[PDB]
Design a binder for this molecule. Structure first.
Ligand SMILES: [Mg+2]
Ligand SMILES: [Zn+2]
Ligand SMILES: [Zn+2]
Lengths: 71, 115, 66, 111, 55, 157, 144, 172, 56, 447, 112, 83, 270, 57
C-alpha cells in the first residue's frame, strides 16, 4: 500500500541533508530510513525526504502517491 | 642471553626493567592486538578479520623481533601519551583520547565477516 | 597501508612529503633526522608520522588485479 | 549505537533558547544564566570581564558535564545594579577590545 | 576426523582419546600465529609442582 | 582497654559541649544527687529484651554489663564536675541522646545473621595472601575438621 | 576594638618543610611573660631574625564608624573598594582566624590558640588579665 | 574507536576509554603539541612499570633524532645516556614538560611527563558486548530464557546473587 | 542448582562499566539504547494520566 | 558476589553514551576497575519491589559495613592525592579560582568566607574551602605521634563546627578508617548527608586538581650519587657478612639452633641478612627522596604505592624465593649451568642486587620469572579453593535468623544463640572505645 | 572448651594477614558448628546429615540420594526454610517476610 | 494464639517492617484506592505512602509471629518510627 | 596604534607561519582567541563521496576518509551558505562545490593518484573556492591512492562548509604555540628538580625579550599576565593573517549574538 | 602440511607466491582440511627407557 517501502531515498534538510539511505519500516507519518555511511537508523517524516531510483536517476518529492509508481 | 625469550616476549621493550607478572600479561594479551595479520587478505574468506587503517612500526625497536617480521607487519600505532591527572576522568584504568586524532584516523580499523 | 594525509596530533599535512622523503633518503645520502628537518617537520609529532610509517600498499599491488 | 551527533554541540535545536535567566533565592540580587551550545570558550571571558567590574560581588561559571555543551553562569551585583546591565557592559567591553585588537593586527600586518 | 575434531583416534572410543591435539590456527595478528605455531601442551587430566618453572 | 562498643559517649558529650557553649569557668548548676539519680535512671532505661519474668529480666540485666561499665566510667561525678562540665539541661540532653542511640543500635528481628556471618568470613579468605600452617589450607582443615592436621602444636606454661 | 598590643621582637625563625610558610618565635620587649609563636607567609610578608613587629588583635576591622559593636557575622565578604577605610590601612599584615583552645599554662600564665586557616598562633600572657578580652574570632594585625 | 573500547600498551597496561576530548580542551605544551592519550599516574608505582617510562623516553629521543632506538634486553643502554641525549636535543633531562590548561590557558603548577609510546588496540569493544533483554525468546524444556547474546538471551541470576539478596532481606 | 537455585531472568542488561566523577554516589549512567530496550509497567491511574498519555 | 555490598540499588540517569557510568567511590565495595569489567543491571517490575530496593539496598544505606565495622567507601585514586595537596599549609588560592570552587559546591549557601590574609592580597587557604564543603555540626579530633595543639608537622586532625583547624587530610581522615570523617558524618547525620559530602568533596578536589596538575615520571625513581654509593656499600657489607657466615659454617664452627639442622639455621641467617640489607637500602632511598617527589607524594597520601615498591624501584629488588625458601638446585648441585657446583653465594641462589631502573641480569630475570610464576599459580589455586569454601559456608548458614524474641534460631527452630552476639547489638552500630576504669594505676584511679 | 579453642583458632587464622572481623560472626559460626555435643564439619557428612528439610539438604549435595532416602522413609517437609520457598517460588519468611500485614476496620472508620 | 496485650516485642518499627508497609501502601495508592492524607501536589505513590506514614495515618496491622506459632498484632499508629 | 586596548608586535611574517606578541591583554581573551582559531573558523572540505567504480586495493571508506582529509581553498568561504540553511534539496552551486576524480592505470609501473587530479565541475560564480591546495615543489599534492595496470578509480565528491568542532577535517590551523612569562616571575608553576632548577630546565627562546629576574627581590604579588607570545601555523586553506582576522571576527560574532539574544529576550519579557 | 616437500610452495619464489595468491610472509606448518587451517599442538610426555626411582608416602 505505502509507496515508501524498499526504495532508496535522500534525506533533505535537518542535520542529514544530502545523505543516502533506504527506508525499511514505515508507520503512520514517521518513516525509518537507514544510513549508508553511518550504522544508525533515523526516523523522519516521509514528505520531507525526496525519492530516488534504485539504479540511479533524478529525484522526486512525495508525489509518488499520485503516480503510484517509482522513478 | 636475549634469545631465551619466546616470540611474544621478544616484542616487549626493556623486559628486564619490568615485573615478571607484567611481562606475562603483555605476552598473553599481545595475541589480541589489532594489525595486518597477512598481506594475503582481500583474497581470503575468513570468518573474522581485523585490519588496522594505518599500522605503524614501533619507535623502540628490539633486535630480537627483526627476524619476526614485526617491523613489516606492525600491530599498533605510535601515539603521544601524557601521564597526568586531567579532569579526573582517567582514574583507575580509564584513559582520555583526543577526539581530533580519532577523527583524523587514529586506531580506526576494518572488520570483515564471511558467511 | 598508505601514508596518512594529516598528522594525528596537530593536523599538519604530511601526505605530500612521502615521495620527497624517499628521494632524499635514496640519493641525497643523509640520515633520517636531517631529511626530516629538511622536509619541514620540526615537532616529533609530525616526525613520527613518516619516520615510523610502513608502506604495505606495494605488497597489496603485487597481486594480480581483476 | 549510542554516539551523539556531532552538530548537537553548536546548533540550537527546537524548544530551547540560547539564554535562560532564573532568579537565585540563596543570595539577594543574584541570578543564574544558562547558556546552550557553548562552553569553556566565552564563559571564561565573560567571567573575567565581570570580575573586572567594580559593582559585581560574585561571578563564576561551571560545566556540569562534558557530554552536554552547556554551562551555568551566576552573577551577584551590588544593590541597585541589575546583573543584566553588568552582562551587557561586559559584552560591550569585549566587543570593543576585540575590534581594537583586530584593527591593530591589521595595521601591523599591513607593513 | 582425527585432524578436524582433534580427538586422536577413530570415531569410536573418542571419549577415551586425547582432546585438543588439533586446533584451529589463530589468525588475528602475525605474532599470534607465530606463537600458536610454536606451542606445546602438557596433558595433566590440583598440583602446583608441574606448573612451576624449573631451572 | 580498646574494645568495640555500641554508643560513643565521647562524641555525644563533645557535641553537647559545642552546642551548649559551656563557659568552662562559671560554676556548674548540677548536683551530686541529681547526677547519681540521672545515671541510675539511664542505666535502668536501657532495654534490649523487654520482658516481665525473672529469667528475661536477669538476661537483660547481665547483657548490658559492659555498656554499664563504660557509662559509669565516662559519667563519674569527678569527671563531670572537673573535665566535662555541663549544666542541668546539657546533662539531660546527653542522657536522652545516649538512651536514643542505644535504643536505635539494637538489632532488628528478621535479619539474616547466618548469611552475613558466612559472607564476612568468606571475604577475607578470598582476600587472604600467601613452621605453623596458616592461611587458606589451615582454614580449610579447620572447617572440614581434619583428624590429622599437618602441623600439630602444643603450648606448656 | 583593639584587644592586644606589643613589640614582640622575633628570633629563631624556622623555615620548616614548606617554601612559603615560616614558623617564628617572638618575645615581648615589655612584659617579661608574653611569648608568641606564629606562622606567616614570608612570600607576601618577609621576616628576618631579630626584628620588631608590632602585633595587634582586634575583634573587628571596622574603624570609628562602628566601635566594635559585635555584628558583622557571615556577611559574605566582598572585595575592597575605593575608600571604606578600616584598621588595615595602618598595618601591613592582616589575618583573620578562629580561637580553638584556652589552656591555662600556670596559676597566672594563660595560653590562647588561634587558627588563621592553616596557620596557627600560640599567645601566652600573664595574670589572666592582659589576655582577658579574648573570646571568639578576631583579626590579627602586624606592623613592620 | 569510541568510549569503552579496550586499549593496552606494550607493558601489560590495559585500559578503556572513559572520556573523549577535542583538541582545544586537551592540555598543550609551549610548542602547541597536544597528547593523543592521557594515562593516570596512579598505575605506575603499584605495578612498578619502569620499562614503560624508559621506552617512552627512548621513543621521544628517537623521534627527535630520527634514528631508531634499541630496546633489546641485557644491553648497555642506560637511562643516563638517554637523558644526556634528550638534554643535548634541548628539551629536558627527565622528559618533563611545561603544559598549559586547555580551558583557561593558565600554566599548570606541576610539569607533565611527555613522549610517544607504542599502543595496541585490543579485540574487545563495547559495541560487541552490550546486551539488553525484555521478554525475549523462550526455551522448550525448562521454559527459561535462552543462553547467549546472539540468541537474545537473558542474564543469569546465580546462587551468589540469591544469597546476597537474602542477606539484604528483600524477600519480595 | 542450574534451574531452581539459580535461573535466568528478564529485564536485565550488561555492558562495560566506566568512571564518571560528575555523577553522584547513588547514580548509574544508563545508555539510551538500554533504557529504550528495558521497560517498567505503570498502572494507569490519576495523578499521572497526562504523563502516561504523552509517553504513549 | 562475595558480600552484600557486591549488589546495591542505584538511581537511573540516562546518558548519551553506551557504557555504564558510576561514581569512583562506589568501585571499592564492588571491587571493580575500568580495564574491561562488565557489570549487570536489574530493573524491578513492581511497586513493592521498588520500595524494598529503595529502602533496603540503597547506596547511602550501605556506607558502614557490618563485617569489619568500618565504612566500605571512601576517597580513593587521584582524589586522595588532590585532597592531600590542597590541604597543605603552603597552599593558597586566589579570588578568581575561589569563586569557581565555591560555585562548584551544589549546596553552597552563598556566603563567601573571609580570606585568611586580607592586607597584602586576599588569599584563601585550601582548608577553608574544604571546610566549606564539609557540613556544619561535625567535630572530629585525632592526635597522631608528636601531635599537640600547635603541631608543627601538620599531623593529626582537628575539626570544630565543620571547620578544619590544622592537620593534612589523608587516607586516615577521608578513607576507610575506624573514626574517620565518613564514619562520624554517617553516625551523626543521615546517609544522604554523607552522600552529599562525598559528591561535594569529589567535585571540589577534582576541579582543584584539574586546574593545578599532577604527574609522574622516570626521574622520580632516580636517586643521587651519594645515596647509590651508600646503598652499594650496604649491599657489599651484607654480602661480606654472608660470606663470613658461609666460611664459618664450612669449617663446622657454626652452632645450630635447637630444633633445627645445620642447614636450616644457616639458610635462615642468610635470608634474614639479605632481607635486613634490602630493608635498610629501601629506607635509605626513601629518606633521600625529596618532598616534591611524585611517588613519595602518592605514597604519603595513601592512594597508591608503598615503601616496598619504592625500595624495589629505586634501591634494590628483594631476593627471589620459592614457597619461602631460596632457589633450589635444579641441576646437580647447581641452580644454572652458568654457575659452579656447590655454590651457596647469594647471587647464585636467587638474590637480586640491581633495581628495576638499573636493569636485571639474565639470572635474576629468570629468578623473578620463577617468582611470578609461583604467584600466578598461587592465585589460580587459591581462587578456586576460596570459592568452594565460601559456597560451603554460605550453604551451611543460610537458615539462621533472629526472631522477635531476640533469639537466634535456624529453620528447625533450634536455639543456637539466646541473644545475637551475646549482646543483641547491630554490627554496623558499634564503635571502638576505650575503658578508663580497667587501665591506669591504683593511685591514678583513686585520684 | 573445644568451642573456645575453635574460636581462638578461627580468630588466629583470620587475623594472620591483618584483617579485622567482628566477633559476632565468628561466635555465630562456632556456635553453629558446635550446637551438638561435638564438631559438625561444614561438609556432606556434617551439617548435611541433620533433621532439616529434605529439599534444603538435597539442594547442597547428593541430590538424588537424599530424595531417595526421603521417599523410602516418611519425611514431612514443614517448609519454612528459605531453600524450600525458593524451590516453590513463594515469599520466604525472612527479612520482610517474617510478618504478615492486615487491614483493620476501626482504623478505616476512624481515619475517614 | 494471640498474646492479648501483654505483648513483649519492641514498641518501634523495624527497617523491614517500614519497607513492607511503604511498598504495600505505594502499590495500593498506585492502584485506584482511597488516600487518607492531603496529596498537596504529590503524584508519586511512594512519596504519598511516606506522607501518610509521617503522622501515622496508615490503617495497617503488623502481625509478628513468634517462633512457636503465636502472634501478636501491632497497629501502625502505635509503632514508634525512629529510623 | 588604534585604541588603548590590546597591542600586537609581529616578529616574523610568512605564508604559512606568523609570529607576534600580544600586549595589554588578559589571559582569558588570549585563550579564547586560541580556541576559536583552533576549532571555530569555517572551512570548505569534502563531505559526501559517491563511488562509481573502485577496482583498487583500498576500501571505499579508506578513500572517502583520505579525500575528506584533503585541504581545499576557502578564501571566499563567506560567500557560501551552510547546507542546512539552504533551500535546495541536497546541494547546489550556491551552497556546495562538486569535484570529480577519474584515474586509470595504463603504464606498467604504478600510477599514483594526486590531489591535483581533482577537477571542479560545478560553477564557482567567480568565487575563489574549491581549488585543491598544492604546496609541494613538484606540484603534485596529496597522494590519494596508487594504481597498477588494469585498475580504475572513478568517483564524485561534493564540498560543504563546516567548522572544526563538527569534524577535525575542517580545521584551518595545524598547531598554535601559546606561551607567556618565560621566567617564573609570576610563580605560576613549580619547577621539578633534583639538584638545581636553572641548570636542569632549559631556557625558552622567548627569555631574550624579557628582563631577567633580579636576585634578592620581593615577590611581586600585584603583577598579572599581560604579555603573550603566539605562533600560528596554517594548513594552507587560509592564510595566517586571514586566520587570525577570522578568529577575531568569530569571537566578536559570538559575543554580538549573545548580546542580541539578551536584548531580544529582555524585549519579549517586558 | 604447508611448505613441505610434497607442497607446491616449497620451491616457489616470491613471484610465484604472488601469482598463486599466497602471502610471501606466510610460514606454513599447518594443515588445510575442509577449508580450515589446523595446527598440531606438540604433546609433552615422559621419556621412555629411563630408570627412575621415587619415594612413596
Ligand atoms: Mg579489571
Ligand atoms: Zn604534527
Ligand atoms: Zn544549496
Amino acid at each position: 500500500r505505502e509507496v515508501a517501502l524498499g526504495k532508496t531515498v535522500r534525506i533533505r534538510s535537518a542535520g542529514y541533508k544530502g545523505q543516502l539511505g533506504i527506508v525499511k519500516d514505515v508507520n503512520g507519518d514517521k518513516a525509518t530510513v537507514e544510513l549508508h555511511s553511518k550504522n544508525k537508523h533515523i526516523t523522519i517524516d516521509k514528505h520531507k525526504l525526496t525519492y530516488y531510483n534504485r539504479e540511479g536517476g533524478e529525484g522526486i518529492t512525495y508525489d509518488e502517491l499520485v503516480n503510484r509508481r517509482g522513478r | 642471553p636475549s634469545m631465551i625469550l619466546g616470540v611474544a616476549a621478544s616484542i616487549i621493550p626493556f623486559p628486564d626493567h619490568n615485573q615478571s607478572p607484567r611481562n606475562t600479561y603483555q605476552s598473553a594479551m599481545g595475541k589480541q592486538a589489532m594489525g595486518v595479520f597477512l598481506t594475503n587478505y582481500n583474497v581470503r574468506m575468513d570468518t573474522m578479520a581485523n585490519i588496522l587503517y594505518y599500522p605503524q612500526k614501533p619507535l623502540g625497536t628490539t633486535r630480537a623481533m627483526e627476524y619476526l617480521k614485526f617491523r613489516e607487519l606492525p600491530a599498533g600505532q605510535n601515539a603521544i601519551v601524557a601521564i597526568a591527572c586531567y579532569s579526573g576522568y582517567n582514574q583507575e584504568d580509564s584513559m582520555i583520547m583526543n577526539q581530533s586524532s580519532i577523527d583524523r584516523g587514529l586506531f580506526r580499523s576494518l572488520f570483515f565477516r564471511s558467511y | 597501508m598508505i601514508v596518512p594525509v594529516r598528522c594525528f596530533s596537530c593536523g599538519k599535512v604530511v601526505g605530500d612529503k612521502w615521495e620527497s622523503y624517499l628521494n632524499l633518503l635514496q640519493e641525497d645520502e643523509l640520515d633520517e633526522g636531517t631529511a626530516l628537518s629538511r622536509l619541514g617537520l620540526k615537532r616529533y609529532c609530525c616526525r613520527r608520522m613518516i619516520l615510523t610509517h610502513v608502506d604495505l600498499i606495494e605488497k597489496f599491488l603485487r597481486y594480480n588485479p581483476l | 549505537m549510542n554516539a551523539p551527533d556531532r552538530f548537537e554541540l553548536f546548533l540550537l535545536g527546537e524548544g530551547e533558547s540560547k539564554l535562560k535567566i532564573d532568579p537565585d533565592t540563596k543570595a539577594p540580587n543574584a541570578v543564574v544564566i544558562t547558556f546552550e551550545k557553548e562552553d569553556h570558550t566565552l564563559g571564561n571571558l565573560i567571567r573575567a570581564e565581570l570580575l573586572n567590574d567594580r559593582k559585581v560581588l560574585f561571578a563564576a561559571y561551571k560545566v556540569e558535564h562534558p557530554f552536554f555543551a552547556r554551562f551555568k553562569l551566576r552573577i551577584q551585583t551590588t544593590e541597585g545594579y541589575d546583573p543584566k546591565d553588568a552582562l551587557k557592559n561586559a559584552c560591550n567591553s569585549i566587543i570593543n577590545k576585540l575590534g581594537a585588537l583586530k584593527t591593530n593586527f591589521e595595521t601591523e600586518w599591513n607593513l | 576426523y582425527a585432524l578436524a575434531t582433534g580427538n586422536w583416534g577413530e570415531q569410536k572410543k573418542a571419549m577415551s582419546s586425547r582432546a585438543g591435539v588439533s586446533q584451529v590456527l589463530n589468525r588475528y595478528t602475525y605474532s599470534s600465529t607465530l606463537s600458536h605455531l610454536r606451542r606445546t601442551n602438557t596433558p595433566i587430566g590440583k598440583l602446583a609442582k608441574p606448573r612451576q618453572l624449573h631451572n | 582497654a580498646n574494645w568495640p562498643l555500641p554508643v560513643n559517649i565521647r562524641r555525644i558529650i563533645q557535641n553537647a559541649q559545642q552546642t551548649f557553649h559551656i563557659d568552662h569557668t562559671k560554676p556548674s548548676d548540677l548536683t551530686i544527687k541529681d547526677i547519681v539519680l540521672g545515671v541510675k535512671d539511664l542505666q535502668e532505661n536501657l532495654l534490649v529484651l523487654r520482658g516481665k519474668n525473672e529469667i528475661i529480666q536477669n538476661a537483660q540485666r547481665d547483657a548490658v554489663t559492659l555498656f554499664c561499665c563504660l557509662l559509669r566510667s565516662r559519667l563519674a561525678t569527678r569527671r563531670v564536675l572537673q573535665e566535662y562540665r555541663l549544666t542541668k539541661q546539657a546533662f539531660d540532653w546527653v542522657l536522652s541522646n545516649i538512651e536514643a542511640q542505644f535504643l536505635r543500635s539494637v538489632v532488628h528481628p528478621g535479619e539474616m545473621v547466618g548469611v552475613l556471618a558466612a559472607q564476612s568470613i568468606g571475604e577475607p579468605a578470598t582476600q587472604m595472601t600467601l613452621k605453623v600452617t596458616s592461611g587458606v589450607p589451615r582454614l580449610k582443615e579447620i572447617l572440614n575438621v581434619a583428624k590429622n592436621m599437618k602441623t600439630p602444636s602444643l603450648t606448656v606454661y | 576594638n583593639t584587644l592586644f598590643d606589643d613589640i614582640f621582637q622575633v628570633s629563631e625563625v624556622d623555615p620548616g618543610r614548606y617554601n612559603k610558610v615560616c614558623r617564628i618565635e617572638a618575645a615581648s620587649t615589655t612584659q617579661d611573660q608574653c611569648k608568641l609563636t606564629l606562622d606567616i607567609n614570608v612570600e607576601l610578608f618577609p621576616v628576618a631574625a631579630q626584628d620588631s613587629l608590632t602585633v595587634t588583635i582586634a575583634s573587628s576591622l571596622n574603624l570609628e564608624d562602628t566601635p566594635a559593636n559585635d555584628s558583622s557575622a557571615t556577611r559574605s565578604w566582598r572585595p575592597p573598594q575605593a575608600g571604606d577605610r578600616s584598621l588595615a590601612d595602618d598595618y601591613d599584615y592582616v589575618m583573620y582566624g578562629t580561637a580553638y583552645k584556652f589552656e591555662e599554662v600556670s596559676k597566672d600564665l594563660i595560653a590562647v590558640y588561634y587558627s588563621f586557616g592553616g596557620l596557627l598562633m600560640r599567645l601566652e600572657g600573664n595574670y589572666r588579665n592582659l589576655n582577658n578580652l579574648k573570646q571568639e574570632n578576631a583579626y590579627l594585625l602586624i606592623r613592620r | 574507536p569510541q568510549i569503552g573500547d579496550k586499549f593496552a600498551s606494550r607493558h601489560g597496561q590495559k585500559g578503556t576509554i572513559g572520556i573523549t576530548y577535542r583538541r582545544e580542551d586537551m592540555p598543550f605544551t609551549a610548542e602547541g603539541i597536544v597528547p593523543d592519550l592521557i594515562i593516570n599516574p596512579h598505575a605506575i608505582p603499584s605495578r612498578m612499570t619502569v620499562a614503560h617510562l624508559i621506552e617512552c623516553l627512548l621513543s621521544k629521543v628517537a623521534a627527535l633524532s630520527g634514528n631508531e632506538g634499541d630496546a633489546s634486553p641485557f644491553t648497555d643502554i642506560t637511562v643516563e645516556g638517554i637523558s644526556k641525549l634528550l638534554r643535548e636535543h634541548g628539551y629536558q633531562s627527565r622528559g618533563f614538560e611545561v603544559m598549559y590548561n586547555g580551558h583557561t590557558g593558565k600554566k599548570l603548577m606541576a610539569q607533565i611527563f611527555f613522549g610517544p609510546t607504542y599502543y595496541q588496540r585490543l579485540r574487545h569493544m563495547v559495541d560487541d558486548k552490550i546486551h539488553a533483554r525484555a521478554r525475549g525468546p523462550m526455551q522448550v524444556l525448562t521454559r527459561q530464557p535462552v543462553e547467549g547474546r546472539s540468541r537474545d538471551g537473558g542474564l543469569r541470576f546465580g546462587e551468589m546473587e540469591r544469597d546476597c539478596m537474602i542477606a539484604h532481606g528483600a524477600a519480595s | 542448582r542450574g534451574n531452581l537455585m539459580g535461573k535466568r531472568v528478564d529485564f536485565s542488561a550488561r555492558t562495560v562499566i566506566s568512571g564518571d566523577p560528575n555523577l553522584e554516589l547513588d547514580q548509574v549512567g544508563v545508555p539510551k539504547s538500554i533504557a529504550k530496550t528495558l521497560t517498567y509497567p505503570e498502572v494507569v491511574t490519576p495523578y499521572n494520566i497526562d504523563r502516561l498519555t504523552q509517553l504513549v | 558476589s562475595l558480600h552484600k555490598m557486591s549488589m546495591m540499588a542505584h538511581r537511573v540517569k540516562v546518558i548519551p553514551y553506551s557504557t555504564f557510568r558510576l561514581n569512583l567511590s562506589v568501585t571499592s565495595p564492588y571491587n571493580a576497575d575500568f580495564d574491561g569489567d562488565e557489570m549487570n543491571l536489574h530493573v524491578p517490575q513492581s511497586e513493592e519491589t521498588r520500595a524494598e530496593l529503595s529502602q533496603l539496598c540503597a547506596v547511602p544505606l550501605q556506607i558502614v559495613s557490618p563485617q569489619s565495622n568500618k565504612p566500605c567507601m571512601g576517597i580513593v585514586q587521584d582524589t586522595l592525592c588532590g585532597i592531600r595537596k590542597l590541604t597543605l599549609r603552603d597552599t593558597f588560592i586566589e579570588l578568581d579560582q575561589v569563586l569557581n570552587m565555591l560555585y562548584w559546591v551544589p549546596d553552597w549557601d552563598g556566603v563567601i568566607p573571609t580570606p585568611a590574609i586580607i592586607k597584602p592580597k586576599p588569599l584563601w587557604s585550601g582548608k577553608q574551602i574544604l571546610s566549606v564543603a564539609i557540613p556544619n555540626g561535625i567535630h572530629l579530633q585525632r592526635f597522631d605521634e608528636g601531635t599537640t595543639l600547635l603541631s608543627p608537622k601538620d599531623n593529626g586532625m582537628l575539626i570544630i563546627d565543620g571547620q578544619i583547624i590544622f592537620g593534612v587530610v589523608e587516607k586516615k581522615t577521608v578513607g576507610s578508617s575506624n573514626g574517620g570523617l565518613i564514619h562520624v558524618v554517617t553516625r551523626e547525620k543521615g546517609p544522604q548527608v554523607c552522600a552529599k559530602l562525598f559528591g561535594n568533596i569529589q567535585k571540589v578536589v577534582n576541579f582543584w586538581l584539574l586546574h593545578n596538575g599532577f604527574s609522574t615520571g622516570i626521574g622520580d625513581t632516580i636517586a643521587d650519587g651519594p645515596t647509590m654509593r651508600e646503598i652499594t656499600e650496604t649491599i657489599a657489607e651484607a654480602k661480606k657478612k654472608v660470606l663470613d657466615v658461609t666460611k664459618e659454617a664450612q669449617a663446622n664452627l657454626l652452632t645450630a639452633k635447637h630444633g633445627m639442622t645445620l642447614r636450616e639455621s644457616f639458610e635462615d641467617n642468610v635470608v634474614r641478612f639479605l632481607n635486613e640489607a634490602r630493608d635498610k637500602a629501601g629506607r635509605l632511598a626513601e629518606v633521600n627522596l625529596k618532598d616534591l617527589n611524585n611517588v613519595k607524594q602518592m605514597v604519603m597520601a595513601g592512594s597508591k604505592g608503598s615503601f616496598i615498591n619504592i625500595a624495589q624501584m629505586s634501591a634494590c629488588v628483594g631476593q627471589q624465593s620459592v614457597e619461602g625458601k631460596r632457589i633450589a638446585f635444579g641441576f646437580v648441585d647447581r641452580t644454572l649451568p652458568h654457575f659452579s657446583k656447590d655454590d651457596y653465594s647469594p647471587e647464585s641462589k636467587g638474590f637480586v642486587e640491581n633495581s628495576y631502573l638499573r636493569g636485571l641480569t639474565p639470572q635474576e630475570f629468570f629468578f623473578h620469572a620463577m617468582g611470578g610464576r609461583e604467584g600466578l599459580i598461587d592465585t589460580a589455586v587459591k581462587t578456586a579453593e576460596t570459592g568452594y569454601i565460601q559456597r560451603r559456608l554460605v550453604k551451611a548458614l543460610e537458615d539462621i535468623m533472629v526472631h522477635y524474641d531476640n533469639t537466634t534460631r535456624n529453620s528447625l527452630g533450634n536455639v543456637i544463640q539466646f541473644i545475637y552476639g551475646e549482646d543483641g547489638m547491630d554490627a554496623a552500630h558499634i564503635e571502638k572505645q576505650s575503658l578508663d576504669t580497667i587501665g591506669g594505676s591504683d593511685a591514678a584511679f583513686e585520684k | 572448651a573445644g568451642r573456645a579453642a575453635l574460636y581462638k583458632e578461627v580468630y588466629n587464622v583470620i587475623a594472620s594477614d591483618g584483617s579485622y572481623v567482628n566477633y559476632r560472626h565468628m561466635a555465630l559460626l562456632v556456635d553453629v558448628m558446635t550446637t551438638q555435643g561435638g564438631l559438625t564439619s561444614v561438609t556432606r557428612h556434617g551439617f548435611n546429615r541433620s533433621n532439616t528439610g529434605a529439599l534444603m539438604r538435597c539442594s547442597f549435595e547428593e541430590t538424588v540420594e537424599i530424595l531417595f532416602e526421603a521417599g523410602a522413609s516418611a519425611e514431612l517437609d514443614d517448609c519454612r526454610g528459605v531453600s524450600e520457598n525458593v524451590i516453590l517460588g513463594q515469599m520466604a519468611p525472612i527479612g520482610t517476610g517474617a510478618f504478615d500485614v492486615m487491614i483493620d476496620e476501626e482504623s478505616l472508620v476512624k481515619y475517614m | 494464639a494471640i498474646p492479648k496485650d501483654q505483648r513483649a516485642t519492641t514498641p518501634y518499627m523495624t527497617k523491614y517492617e517500614r519497607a513492607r508497609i511503604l511498598g504495600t501502601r505505594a502499590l495500593q495508592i498506585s492502584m485506584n484506592a482511597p488516600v487518607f492524607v492531603d496529596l498537596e501536589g504529590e503524584t508519586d505513590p511512594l512519596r504519598i505512602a511516606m506522607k501518610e506514614l509521617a503522622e501515622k495515618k496508615i490503617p495497617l496491622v503488623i502481625r509478628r509471629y513468634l517462633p512457636d506459632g503465636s502472634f501478636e498484632d501491632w497497629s501502625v499508629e502505635e509503632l514508634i518510627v525512629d529510623l | 596604534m588604534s585604541e588603548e586596548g590590546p597591542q600586537v608586535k609581529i616578529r616574523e611574517a610568512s605564508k604559512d607561519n606568523v609570529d607576534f606578541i600580544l600586549s595589554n591583554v588578559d589571559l582569558a581573551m588570549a585563550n579564547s582567541l586560541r580556541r576559536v582559531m583552533i576549532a571555530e573558523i569555517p572551512t570548505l572540505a569534502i563531505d559526501s563521496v559517491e563511488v562509481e567504480t573502485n577496482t583498487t586495493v583500498l576500501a571505499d571508506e579508506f578513500i572517502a576518509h583520505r579525500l575528506g582529509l584533503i585541504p581545499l581553498q576557502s578564501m571566499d568561504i563567506e560567500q557560501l551558505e551552510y547546507s542546512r540553511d539552504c533551500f535546495c534539496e541536497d546541494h547546489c552551486d550556491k551552497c556546495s562545490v562538486v569535484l570529480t576524480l577519474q584515474a586509470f592505470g595504463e603504464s606498467e609501473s604504478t600510477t599514483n593518484v594526486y590531489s591535483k587530479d581533482l577537477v571542479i565541475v560545478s560553477n564557482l560564480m567567480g568565487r575563489n573556492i574549491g581549488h585543491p591546495i598544492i604546496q609541494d615543489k613538484e606540484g603534485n599534492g596529496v597522494l590519494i591512492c596508487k594504481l597498477r595496470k588494469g585498475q580504475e578509480l572513478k568517483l564524485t565528491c561534493v564540498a560543504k562548509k563546516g567548522i572544526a568542532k563538527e569534524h577535525a577535517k575542517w580545521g584551518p590551523a595545524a598547531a598554535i604555540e601559546f606561551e607567556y612569562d618565560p621566567w617564573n616571575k609570576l610563580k605560576h608553576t613549580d619547577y621539578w628538580y633534583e639538584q638545581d632548577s636553572a641548570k636542569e630546565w632549559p631556557q625558552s627562546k622567548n627569555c631574550e625579550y624579557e628582563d631577567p629576574p633580579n636576585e634578592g627581590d620581593p615577590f611581586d604579588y600585584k603583577a598579572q599576565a599581560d604579555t603573550f607570545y603566539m605562533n600560528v601555523e596554517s594548513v594552507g586553506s587560509i592564510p595566517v593573517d586571514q586566520v587570525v582576522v577570522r578568529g577575531i571576527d568569530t569571537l566578536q560574532k559570538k559575543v554580538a549574538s549573545i548580546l542580541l539574544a539578551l536584548t531580544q529576550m529582555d524585549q519579549d519579557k517586558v | 602440511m604447508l611448505r613441505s616437500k610434497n607442497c607446491y610452495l616449497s620451491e616457489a619464489t616470491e613471484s610465484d607466491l604472488y601469482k598463486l595468491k599466497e602471502c610471501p610472509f606466510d610460514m606454513g606448518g599447518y594443515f588445510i582440511i575442509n577449508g580450515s587451517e589446523k595446527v598440531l599442538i606438540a604433546q609433552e610426555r615422559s621419556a621412555g627407557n629411563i630408570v627412575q626411582v621415587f619415594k612413596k608416602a
